[PDB]
Curated annotation (Swiss-Prot):
GO cellular component, one term: plasma membrane
Keyword 4Fe-4S: no
Protein name per UniProt: GTPase HRas
Modified residues (N-acetylthreonine): 2
Regulation affecting activity: Alternates between an inactive form bound to GDP and an active form bound to GTP. Activated by a guanine nucleotide-exchange factor (GEF) and inactivated by a GTPase-activating protein (GAP).
GO BP, one annotated term: positive regulation of fibroblast proliferation
PROSITE patterns: RAS (PS51421)
Taxonomic source organism: Homo sapiens (Human)
Length: 160
């Protein structure tokens, strides 16, 4: 069957794992590869997701997994301005290693259940527009937009 190699990236603590675990095991963790047969738009397929460590110890450790990844979830948290500003560094790294200005990618603003937000939706939407990539807000806690984000990424890969 078609397999989709997806890679979840982002600054420490933004909810890369919570999003992956909500999708795969259907529960929010208040506190690494995953493989799952799913059916998306009638297509039977396997999601092979890499949930990357947050520690900036990489760049040679990062290049290996970015090279095999087909599409990328670039995650920041909406109560975390630094995690948002860090997004540019992740995209420029994916582009460097994949020798492409166009890589299937979705910008995800996670933790949209929280009221104490420091990054506004219009801000991130305008960023995503400049990249030419979709923007989707999620909450791994409420499960809002979780399937949305991953499925939109699969569809971006299908259109590449
Ligand atoms: N209210 C919300 N909290 C969220 C959410 N996602 C994560 N979390 C919480 O944020 C904390 C960190 O989440 P998580 O470990 O899933 O993030 P990361 O994978 O990015 N951490 P890391 O691997 O970079 N590790 C250091 C942890 O306490 C979660 O329960 C969410 O949607 N809303
Ligand atoms: Mg994690």
């Amino acid at each position: 069957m078609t397999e989709y190699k997806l890679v979840v990236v982002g600054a420490v603590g933004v909810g890369k794992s919570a999003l992956t675990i909500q999708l795969i095991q259907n529960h929010f963790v208040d506190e690494d590869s995953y493989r799952k047969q799913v059916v998306i738009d009638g297509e039977t397929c396997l999601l092979d997701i890499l949930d990357t460590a947050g520690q900036e110890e990489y760049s040679a450790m990062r290049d290996q997994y970015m090279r095999t990844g087909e599409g990328f979830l670039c995650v920041f948290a909406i109560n975390n301005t630094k995690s948002f500003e860090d997004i540019h560094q992740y995209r420029e790294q994916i582009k460097r290693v994949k020798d492409s200005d166009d890589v299937p990618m979705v910008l995800v603003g996670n933790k949209c259940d929280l009221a104490a937000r420091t990054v506004e939706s219009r801000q991130a939407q305008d960023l995503a527009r400049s990249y030419g990539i979709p923007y989707i807000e999620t909450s791994a806690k409420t499960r809002q937009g979780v399937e949305d984000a991953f499925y939109t990424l699969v569809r971006e890969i299908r259109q590449h």
